[PDB]
Short mmCIF file of C-alpha atoms in Angstrom, two decimals:
data_model
loop_
_atom_site.label_atom_id
_atom_site.label_comp_id
_atom_site.label_asym_id
_atom_site.label_seq_id
_atom_site.Cartn_x
_atom_site.Cartn_y
_atom_site.Cartn_z
CA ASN A 1 -33.50 88.92 67.15
CA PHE A 2 -31.42 85.48 66.93
CA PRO A 3 -34.00 82.74 66.31
CA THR A 4 -32.77 81.25 69.90
CA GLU A 5 -34.90 78.72 70.31
CA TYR A 6 -35.33 76.94 66.71
CA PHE A 7 -31.42 76.44 66.70
CA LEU A 8 -31.42 75.48 70.43
CA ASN A 9 -34.07 72.88 69.13
CA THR A 10 -32.02 72.27 66.24
CA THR A 11 -28.25 71.44 68.26
CA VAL A 12 -30.08 69.30 70.85
CA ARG A 13 -31.31 66.85 67.73
CA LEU A 14 -28.15 67.09 66.08
CA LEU A 15 -26.54 65.50 69.43
CA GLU A 16 -29.36 63.02 70.04
CA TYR A 17 -28.51 61.34 66.49
CA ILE A 18 -25.05 61.63 66.46
CA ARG A 19 -25.65 59.78 70.13
CA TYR A 20 -23.62 62.80 71.82
CA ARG A 21 -22.39 61.00 74.81
CA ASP A 22 -19.44 60.50 77.22
CA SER A 23 -15.74 58.93 76.18
CA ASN A 24 -13.04 57.13 77.75
CA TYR A 25 -11.29 60.19 76.78
CA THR A 26 -10.13 61.72 80.51
CA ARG A 27 -9.50 65.36 80.83
CA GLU A 28 -5.37 64.23 81.95
CA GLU A 29 -5.04 62.54 78.26
CA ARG A 30 -6.32 65.79 76.27
CA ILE A 31 -4.00 67.52 78.38
CA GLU A 32 -1.77 65.01 77.18
CA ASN A 33 -2.44 65.23 73.62
CA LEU A 34 -2.63 69.40 73.66
CA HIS A 35 0.72 70.05 74.87
CA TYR A 36 2.20 67.59 72.64
CA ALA A 37 0.70 68.74 69.34
CA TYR A 38 0.83 72.46 70.47
CA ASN A 39 4.52 71.86 71.70
CA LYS A 40 6.04 70.60 68.47
CA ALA A 41 3.38 73.29 66.09
CA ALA A 42 4.76 76.04 68.18
CA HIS A 43 8.15 74.96 67.46
CA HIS A 44 7.67 74.82 64.11
CA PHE A 45 6.03 77.87 63.23
CA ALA A 46 8.52 79.35 65.61
CA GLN A 47 11.22 78.17 63.05
CA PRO A 48 13.49 81.01 61.22
CA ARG A 49 12.18 80.80 58.08
CA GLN A 50 8.83 80.09 59.03
CA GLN A 51 8.82 83.58 60.62
CA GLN A 52 9.95 85.23 57.84
CA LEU A 53 8.13 83.58 55.20
CA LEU A 54 3.86 82.69 56.76
CA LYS A 55 3.11 86.36 57.16
CA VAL A 56 0.31 86.11 60.18
CA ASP A 57 0.41 88.58 63.20
CA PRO A 58 1.77 86.91 65.99
CA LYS A 59 -0.93 87.30 68.15
CA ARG A 60 -3.41 85.53 65.76
CA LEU A 61 -1.52 83.17 64.97
CA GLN A 62 -1.00 82.50 68.81
CA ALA A 63 -4.55 82.18 68.41
CA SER A 64 -5.16 80.38 65.25
CA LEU A 65 -2.85 77.19 66.51
CA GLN A 66 -4.56 76.99 69.41
CA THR A 67 -7.95 76.84 68.45
CA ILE A 68 -6.78 74.33 66.00
CA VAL A 69 -4.84 72.13 67.89
CA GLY A 70 -7.94 72.29 70.56
CA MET A 71 -10.03 70.73 67.49
CA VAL A 72 -7.63 68.10 66.48
CA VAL A 73 -6.82 66.48 69.52
CA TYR A 74 -10.80 66.85 70.18
CA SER A 75 -11.65 64.85 66.84
CA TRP A 76 -8.61 62.72 65.97
CA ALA A 77 -8.82 61.51 69.24
CA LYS A 78 -7.91 57.65 68.13
CA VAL A 79 -4.16 58.79 65.88
CA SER A 80 -0.89 59.10 67.72
CA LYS A 81 0.34 62.01 69.33
CA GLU A 82 2.59 62.68 66.50
CA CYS A 83 -0.33 62.70 63.87
CA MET A 84 -2.29 65.43 65.95
CA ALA A 85 0.93 66.99 65.98
CA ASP A 86 1.33 67.15 62.46
CA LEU A 87 -1.99 67.58 61.61
CA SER A 88 -2.39 70.69 63.59
CA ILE A 89 0.34 72.21 61.86
CA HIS A 90 -1.57 71.52 58.63
CA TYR A 91 -4.65 72.99 59.35
CA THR A 92 -2.82 75.89 61.33
CA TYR A 93 -1.00 76.66 57.63
CA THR A 94 -4.37 76.45 55.75
CA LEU A 95 -6.45 78.64 58.70
CA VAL A 96 -3.89 81.25 58.88
CA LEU A 97 -4.46 81.90 54.32
CA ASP A 98 -7.63 83.30 55.56
CA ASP A 99 -6.13 86.05 56.73
CA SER A 100 -4.05 87.39 53.28
CA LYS A 101 -5.61 89.98 51.03
CA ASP A 102 -2.72 89.60 48.82
CA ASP A 103 -3.85 88.14 45.64
CA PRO A 104 -2.39 85.10 44.28
CA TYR A 105 -2.50 85.99 40.95
CA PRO A 106 0.78 87.19 40.22
CA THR A 107 2.25 83.82 42.23
CA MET A 108 0.29 81.53 40.54
CA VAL A 109 1.33 82.47 36.82
CA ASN A 110 4.07 79.71 36.53
CA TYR A 111 2.61 77.50 39.31
CA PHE A 112 1.90 74.55 37.29
CA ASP A 113 5.81 74.82 35.66
CA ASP A 114 7.64 75.58 38.82
CA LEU A 115 5.80 72.21 40.19
CA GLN A 116 6.57 69.68 37.21
CA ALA A 117 10.42 71.01 37.61
CA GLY A 118 11.15 70.70 40.66
CA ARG A 119 11.40 74.36 41.54
CA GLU A 120 10.16 76.40 44.77
CA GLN A 121 7.24 78.11 44.66
CA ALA A 122 6.75 81.47 44.24
CA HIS A 123 3.66 81.86 46.98
CA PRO A 124 5.40 81.77 49.94
CA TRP A 125 2.62 79.60 51.33
CA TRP A 126 2.63 77.17 49.04
CA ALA A 127 6.47 77.03 49.68
CA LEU A 128 6.37 76.25 53.09
CA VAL A 129 3.10 74.12 53.13
CA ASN A 130 4.55 71.45 50.11
CA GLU A 131 8.19 71.68 52.17
CA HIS A 132 5.96 70.62 55.26
CA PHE A 133 3.44 67.99 53.99
CA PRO A 134 5.53 65.06 53.67
CA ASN A 135 5.49 65.23 57.84
CA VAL A 136 1.77 64.69 57.41
CA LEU A 137 1.53 62.52 54.63
CA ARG A 138 4.04 60.10 55.92
CA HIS A 139 1.25 58.55 58.25
CA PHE A 140 -0.78 57.89 55.39
CA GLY A 141 -1.67 55.57 52.41
CA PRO A 142 -1.05 56.88 49.26
CA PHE A 143 -4.97 57.03 48.43
CA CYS A 144 -5.37 58.53 51.74
CA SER A 145 -2.38 61.06 50.85
CA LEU A 146 -3.83 61.27 47.47
CA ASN A 147 -7.03 63.48 49.30
CA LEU A 148 -4.97 65.39 51.35
CA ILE A 149 -3.12 66.97 48.37
CA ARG A 150 -6.41 67.86 45.95
CA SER A 151 -8.30 69.13 49.16
CA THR A 152 -5.51 71.56 50.47
CA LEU A 153 -4.93 72.94 46.47
CA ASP A 154 -9.32 73.23 46.30
CA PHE A 155 -8.31 74.97 49.85
CA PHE A 156 -6.37 77.32 48.19
CA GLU A 157 -8.51 77.91 45.21
CA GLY A 158 -11.59 78.96 47.80
CA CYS A 159 -9.79 81.10 49.64
CA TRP A 160 -8.74 82.94 46.15
CA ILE A 161 -12.20 83.19 45.30
CA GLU A 162 -12.71 84.46 48.60
CA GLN A 163 -10.96 87.73 48.81
CA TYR A 164 -13.73 89.19 46.07
CA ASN A 165 -16.04 88.92 48.80
CA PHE A 166 -18.81 87.30 46.42
CA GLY A 167 -21.76 85.69 47.73
CA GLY A 168 -22.85 84.23 43.84
CA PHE A 169 -25.35 85.78 41.24
CA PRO A 170 -29.34 85.81 42.11
CA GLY A 171 -29.94 83.00 40.48
CA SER A 172 -27.22 80.68 40.54
CA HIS A 173 -28.25 77.52 43.00
CA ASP A 174 -25.38 75.78 42.74
CA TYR A 175 -22.90 78.89 43.88
CA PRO A 176 -23.14 77.96 47.24
CA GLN A 177 -22.13 74.26 47.97
CA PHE A 178 -19.74 74.83 44.78
CA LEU A 179 -17.64 77.78 47.25
CA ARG A 180 -18.65 75.76 51.04
CA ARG A 181 -16.67 72.43 49.39
CA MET A 182 -14.19 74.81 48.10
CA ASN A 183 -12.95 76.35 51.28
CA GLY A 184 -14.57 73.50 53.23
CA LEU A 185 -11.01 70.88 53.29
CA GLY A 186 -13.00 68.40 53.63
CA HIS A 187 -11.60 65.52 51.72
CA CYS A 188 -8.43 66.36 54.01
CA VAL A 189 -10.52 66.05 57.08
CA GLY A 190 -12.27 62.90 55.87
CA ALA A 191 -9.15 61.27 54.49
CA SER A 192 -6.98 62.03 57.96
CA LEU A 193 -8.73 60.37 59.95
CA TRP A 194 -7.43 56.84 58.36
CA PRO A 195 -3.42 56.47 59.48
CA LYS A 196 -1.68 53.64 57.85
CA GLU A 197 -0.83 52.86 60.95
CA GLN A 198 -4.08 51.80 62.30
CA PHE A 199 -6.13 51.31 59.21
CA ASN A 200 -5.74 49.06 56.07
CA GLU A 201 -6.42 52.04 53.08
CA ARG A 202 -7.03 48.72 50.78
CA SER A 203 -9.11 46.51 52.96
CA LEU A 204 -10.96 49.52 53.88
CA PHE A 205 -10.99 51.34 50.93
CA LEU A 206 -15.19 50.97 50.65
CA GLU A 207 -15.66 52.14 53.74
CA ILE A 208 -12.70 54.88 53.67
CA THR A 209 -14.37 56.06 50.59
CA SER A 210 -17.80 56.29 52.34
CA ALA A 211 -16.52 58.45 55.10
CA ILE A 212 -14.72 60.95 53.06
CA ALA A 213 -17.92 61.33 50.84
CA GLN A 214 -20.29 61.72 53.85
CA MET A 215 -17.81 63.04 56.36
CA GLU A 216 -17.19 66.30 53.92
CA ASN A 217 -20.73 67.05 54.47
CA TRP A 218 -21.11 66.32 57.93
CA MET A 219 -18.11 68.38 58.85
CA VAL A 220 -18.78 71.46 57.02
CA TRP A 221 -22.67 71.84 58.01
CA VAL A 222 -22.19 71.09 61.28
CA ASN A 223 -19.47 73.73 61.44
CA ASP A 224 -21.84 76.08 59.29
CA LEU A 225 -24.42 75.29 61.91
CA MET A 226 -22.46 75.82 65.42
CA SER A 227 -20.68 79.26 64.13
CA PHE A 228 -24.06 80.61 63.19
CA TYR A 229 -24.48 82.11 66.44
CA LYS A 230 -20.90 84.18 66.12
CA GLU A 231 -21.28 85.13 62.22
CA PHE A 232 -25.13 86.27 63.38
CA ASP A 233 -24.18 89.50 63.92
CA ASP A 234 -20.91 89.90 62.42
CA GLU A 235 -21.11 92.44 59.49
CA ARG A 236 -17.57 91.62 59.08
CA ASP A 237 -18.40 88.04 57.99
CA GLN A 238 -20.18 88.55 54.54
CA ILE A 239 -20.15 85.56 52.31
CA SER A 240 -20.96 82.14 54.92
CA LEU A 241 -22.56 79.21 53.24
CA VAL A 242 -25.86 80.47 54.87
CA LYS A 243 -25.26 84.33 53.50
CA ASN A 244 -24.69 82.96 50.24
CA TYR A 245 -27.82 80.98 49.92
CA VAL A 246 -30.01 84.19 50.92
CA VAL A 247 -28.13 86.25 47.68
CA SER A 248 -27.90 83.09 45.00
CA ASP A 249 -31.42 81.76 46.27
CA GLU A 250 -32.93 84.47 46.52
CA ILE A 251 -34.76 83.63 50.27
CA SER A 252 -35.16 84.49 54.07
CA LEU A 253 -31.86 84.64 56.20
CA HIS A 254 -35.14 81.81 57.96
CA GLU A 255 -35.22 79.89 55.29
CA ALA A 256 -31.79 79.56 54.32
CA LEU A 257 -30.96 78.45 58.12
CA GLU A 258 -34.11 75.51 56.93
CA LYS A 259 -31.89 74.44 54.46
CA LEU A 260 -28.74 74.13 56.66
CA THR A 261 -30.66 72.38 59.69
CA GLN A 262 -32.49 70.09 57.37
CA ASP A 263 -29.00 69.04 55.50
CA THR A 264 -27.33 68.95 59.07
CA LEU A 265 -29.91 66.82 60.39
CA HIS A 266 -30.21 64.49 57.79
CA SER A 267 -26.55 63.85 57.06
CA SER A 268 -26.67 63.12 60.57
CA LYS A 269 -28.95 60.79 60.04
CA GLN A 270 -27.08 58.72 57.49
CA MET A 271 -24.11 58.90 58.98
CA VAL A 272 -25.59 56.66 61.98
CA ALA A 273 -27.41 54.71 59.65
CA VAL A 274 -24.39 53.37 58.13
CA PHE A 275 -21.10 52.80 59.69
CA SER A 276 -23.12 51.04 63.14
CA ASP A 277 -22.96 47.68 61.45
CA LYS A 278 -19.65 48.50 59.93
CA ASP A 279 -16.23 47.41 61.33
CA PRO A 280 -16.16 48.96 65.27
CA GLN A 281 -12.55 50.44 65.10
CA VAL A 282 -13.67 52.48 62.04
CA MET A 283 -17.34 53.46 62.95
CA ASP A 284 -15.18 54.26 66.38
CA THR A 285 -13.11 57.14 64.97
CA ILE A 286 -16.34 58.15 62.70
CA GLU A 287 -18.06 58.44 66.11
CA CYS A 288 -15.22 60.20 68.01
CA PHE A 289 -14.60 62.46 65.34
CA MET A 290 -18.22 63.91 65.56
CA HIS A 291 -18.45 64.17 69.43
CA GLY A 292 -15.18 65.65 69.83
CA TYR A 293 -15.87 67.82 66.92
CA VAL A 294 -19.01 69.28 68.88
CA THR A 295 -17.06 69.24 71.93
CA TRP A 296 -14.72 71.68 70.28
CA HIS A 297 -17.69 74.35 69.15
CA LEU A 298 -19.69 74.21 72.22
CA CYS A 299 -16.03 74.68 74.37
CA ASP A 300 -13.44 77.39 72.03
CA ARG A 301 -14.51 80.68 73.04
CA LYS A 302 -14.30 81.42 69.54
CA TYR A 303 -18.29 80.17 68.98
CA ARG A 304 -19.13 82.00 71.60
CA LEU A 305 -21.47 79.47 73.07
CA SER A 306 -21.40 80.15 76.09
CA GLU A 307 -23.12 82.66 75.72
CA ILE A 308 -26.23 80.79 74.67
CA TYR A 309 -25.99 78.66 77.52
CA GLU A 310 -26.08 81.40 79.79
CA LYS A 311 -29.43 82.69 78.52
CA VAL A 312 -30.78 79.75 78.98
CA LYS A 313 -29.58 77.62 81.42
CA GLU A 314 -32.62 78.38 83.82
CA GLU A 315 -35.82 77.63 81.76
CA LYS A 316 -37.99 74.33 82.46
CA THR A 317 -38.17 74.12 78.23
CA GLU A 318 -37.37 70.48 77.36
CA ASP A 319 -34.16 72.17 74.61
CA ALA A 320 -32.98 74.64 76.50
CA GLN A 321 -32.42 71.90 79.44
CA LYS A 322 -31.34 69.54 76.84
CA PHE A 323 -29.28 71.35 75.37
CA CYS A 324 -27.50 72.65 79.03
CA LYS A 325 -27.01 68.96 80.19
CA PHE A 326 -24.73 68.49 76.41
CA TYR A 327 -23.82 71.63 76.82
CA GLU A 328 -22.13 70.90 80.58
CA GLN A 329 -20.88 67.35 79.47
CA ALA A 330 -18.71 68.68 76.75
CA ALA A 331 -17.79 71.28 79.28
CA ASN A 332 -17.02 68.63 81.98
CA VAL A 333 -14.48 67.31 79.51
CA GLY A 334 -13.53 69.82 77.24
CA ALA A 335 -13.28 72.97 79.48
CA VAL A 336 -9.53 73.56 79.58
CA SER A 337 -7.25 76.27 80.67
CA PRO A 338 -4.97 76.96 77.70
CA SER A 339 -2.16 77.45 80.45
CA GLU A 340 -2.13 74.03 81.29
CA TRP A 341 -0.92 73.06 77.49
CA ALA A 342 -0.78 75.79 75.25
CA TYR A 343 3.10 77.38 76.66
CA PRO A 344 5.26 78.90 76.04
CA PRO A 345 3.69 81.67 73.27
CA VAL A 346 5.42 80.79 69.98
CA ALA A 347 6.56 84.34 69.56
CA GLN A 348 9.22 83.68 72.81
CA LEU A 349 10.41 80.41 71.20
CA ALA A 350 10.54 82.40 68.18
CA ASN A 351 12.66 85.34 69.83
CA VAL A 352 14.89 83.22 71.74
#
């Protein structure tokens, strides 16, 4: 049975800590960006070479793309439309990689030599991603770019490790966060929040670096938390950060969940307790990311949190109501029909 109240309590706390509230991001602007990002991406993924080197089921690509654009537009609120579009493509590539069962070994045998010689990579994924990377990198300074490149490389190894469906050896306490950081894209996400057009990598080096280090853990743990509901009974999903704590540390799913909430809540508090008295433009980007990121989760049908809403909408409980109050907040600005932006389907663009 799902820890419905415990979950609710933790969710409301996280929200208060981060100061979850209303933004000046109008539903009309969201639709403007949503359609803009989706429109550049669908046309990209619809090109021939893309269509033939990126092995993904058409229906899942469409879904993945819509999910990713949703997350970007809603979290990288302050960057430009082009930046959202370009980050949408890169994060859709990374999402798509989890669909491969194919062992990377054979295609990674000459990874370095091909890289150093300027020859196209053997693994089709790497071929598309490195070819398109400049489009994403042009929006950043050398420091931030370096973070993206590294994180994406970590991501690749993360996916490789996961093909083994390995939650860790009982007793290997370091395995869980090791794996979560590899497939997390923490430094990618974190360093992509600062476009050299609205920020100065050098003048803000300390804050940017710090953000990356704190955002890496907030971003991944918040996702682990919000996802805890859909993954609860997913017998297919076997190696989540929480399921690994269970196996690696040898504790109950409950205790594992306790560790996650403790880390998440704390991560939140320190985030706030560090950026408030910091360059406003910076705290704004950070604060907006947190809120949008949370909105997206509550709104995307992928996380099915509306099921929880529908099951506690009527209760005189303090949390139960605080949750709904929050939920309806995100709903009012985030519940947009895909028909208003995500069109036409990638498949149709590719067939033309």
